[model samples]
Target: GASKLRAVLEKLKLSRDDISTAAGMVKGVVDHLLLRLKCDSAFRGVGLLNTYEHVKISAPNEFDVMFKLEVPRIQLEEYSNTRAYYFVKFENPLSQFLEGEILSASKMLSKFRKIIKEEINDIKDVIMKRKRGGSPAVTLLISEKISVDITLALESKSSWPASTQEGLRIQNWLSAKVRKQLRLKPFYLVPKHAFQEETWRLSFSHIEKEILNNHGKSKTCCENKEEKCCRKDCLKLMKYLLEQLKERFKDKKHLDKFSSYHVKTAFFHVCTQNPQDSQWDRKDLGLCFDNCVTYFLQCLRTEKLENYFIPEFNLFSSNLIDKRSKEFLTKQIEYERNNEFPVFDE
Candidate 1:
C-alpha cells in the first residue's frame, strides 16, 4: 500500500484560503505598476493570471508573474548553435527599448527595474529586493512573507521557432488540433542574458499552463461529468520529492541546476508515452507516481533531459548540471525509491 505517499501528497495540498490574501496583494502590485508603464494594446493583460496564482510546489508564499511587452514585427536570430538563446531585432523601433537595430534586453530590463524601484516606496507594506545575479525577475516582498517575481517578457506573434520542430510531441496525448492551436498562439521572449550579449530566452509557460489544466487523453477527462486523472497529483508529488532531495544535498551547488521544470518535462514525456486516461487513474495514484519517478531516473542516468518545447535545449547539459552531480543525484534517487522514499519521511 502507498499510504505514506498518499499522506505526503495530502499534506502538500494547500487549502483555498492558504494563499488567497497573498495572491490578491501580489496582483494589486502588478495592477498598480501597469498604469505606470506604457505599451501598445498588444501586451497580454499583465501576464499569465489565475493559471499560476496557486501552483507553488514548495513555498506557497512566492508567485511568478510575467509582465509582457509587445514586440511587433520583430526578427529573431540564434545567439549560438545551442538554439536556446536568441537575438531579437525589431524591424520598427519600439522607441524606448532599442540599441542600434537590435532590441537591448539588458537596457530594457534595467529601465524596468528602475521604474519598479521608483514606485515601490510609495506602495505600503511592499519592499523591493536587491538584484540577484543572473535572475530575470524584479523581486518584491510583501510584509517579508509573500514574494512576487515580476519578470519582463517580450511577446511576439510570430510562429513557433525552428528549434521546436522536433519538440512538442503532444499529438498522441492532446491531438493535432490542440497542438496546432497552441502553435498559433503568441510565444514570449524573456530578458535572460549572457556576457555582453543581447539575448532573450524563449518562454512557453502559457502553453505549459494550458496543457496542465486540460491534461487528458479525452477533452472531458477532468470535467464535472467525467472521471478525473491523477496527472497533476503525481506531478506535485514528484516536485516535492525533488525539493526534499535538493535540501538534503544543499552543499552540492550544482544540484541547484535541477528545477521543478525538469520534473515537469519528464512528467509530460511520460504522459505522452502512456496516452490513455486510465493510465493516470486516481485509483492508481501510487502507480502513476512510480511511473513518473522511473522516467525521471532514466533521464538523470542518461544526462539528457530535453526541454519539452525546444528539444535541442538540454536541461541537463554538462555546463548546467555537471556529471558528478548527475551521478550523485541518480544514486540518491534510486536509494530513496528502493528504501520507500525516506526523503518524504518526516
Candidate 2:
C-alpha cells in the first residue's frame, strides 16, 4: 500500500517543461498588463506560485495571481462574530469617491475588474471569463486551454484580527517565537460580499505557505542531511484523493464545495495535534496519509470544520455544504479506506 502511495505521487508529478511553458506565457501577459496600468504602484501583482509551491497537485495549466494593494495605516473592524470578515478602515480617505470611514471592497473590486477588462480587450487569445458568484477573481482563459484567476487582495501590516488568537495552535510544533514572527507578517483581505456589508474575507495564504515550507519539528527537519518528513507527500495524497472523489461524484452539488483548503486546514490541525517529525517519518508514509484521512473524516462526521485561522468561520456550514452531501462524502471516503483507496490506482 505504501508502494502504491509512492506510485500515485509519482503519477501526480507535473512536467517541469509544461509548467515553464504555461508560466512563461502567463508572465508575459501579466507583465504587459501591469506595465500598462496607470495604478501600477498601488496594485502589485504577485503570482500564487510562491505560496502554493509545495502542494500543487493539479495541472500546471491553471494559475491564480493576486494583485495585492498595500494599505497604509489600515484598521480592520470585525464584520461578523466569526472575525473572518472585515470592513477595512484607512486612517485617511482611501480614494476621492468612497467614504472616509471604511474602504468599500465591492466598489474597489468592480473598478479593478473594469480596468482589467479594458486592458485585456485588445490582447489576442485571452478571453475574459464570467464572474463566479461570491468569488473575487477575474478569470481569463488563455486560448481556451489555460485558465488564470486574477484576484484583488488588500495587504494589511496590522495585527491579526481577534478570532485568530485561539487558532494557529503551532506553539509546540514551531516555537512560540516562530509563531510570533509569523503573526507579525501581514494578513490579506479579499473582496467577498456577505449580508448587506461590502466585506473582505480574511486570507492567510502567505502564512499558510510559510508554515508548509517550514513544516518540520526541528529547523532543519527537511534540510540536507536531515531526516525528511512525509508532511508534504501526505498533503498531496489527501488533496489528490479529494480531487478524484469529487470527479467521481461530479453530479453531487455540494461535493464540489469541499475544496483543497478544507483538506489543508484539517492537515494543519492534525499536524498541531501530533507535533513531531517522528510521527510523520518518511518510512511511515502510508500511516501518515491514513492519519490525515482519519482527521478529515472526523471533521466530516461532526460537520464542524473551522477555518484554520478563524476558528469561528465554519467551512462545513449548512449553507456552504448540505448534510446529505457530507454523508455521501463520508460513505465514499470510508469505502475507499476499506478498499485501500482504489481510486488512487490508475
TM-score to true structure, per model:
0.90, 0.91
Off by over 4 Å in 1: 15-20, 39-55, 91-93, 133-135, 224-226
What does the lDDT read for residue 108 in candidate 1?
69
Candidate 1 lDDT tens digits, 325-344: 88888998899999999977
Q: Which residue pairs clash within candidate 2?
A: none
Q: What lDDT tens digits, residue by residue, belong to model 2 across residues 248-320? A: 8887575877878889999999899889998988889998999999999989989988888888788988876
TM-score winner among the candidates?
2
Best by lDDT: 1
Instruction: Provide the lDDT at 87 for model 1.
Output: 85
Q: Model 2: residues >4 Å from true position, as ranges?
A: 14-19, 39-56, 91-93, 224-226
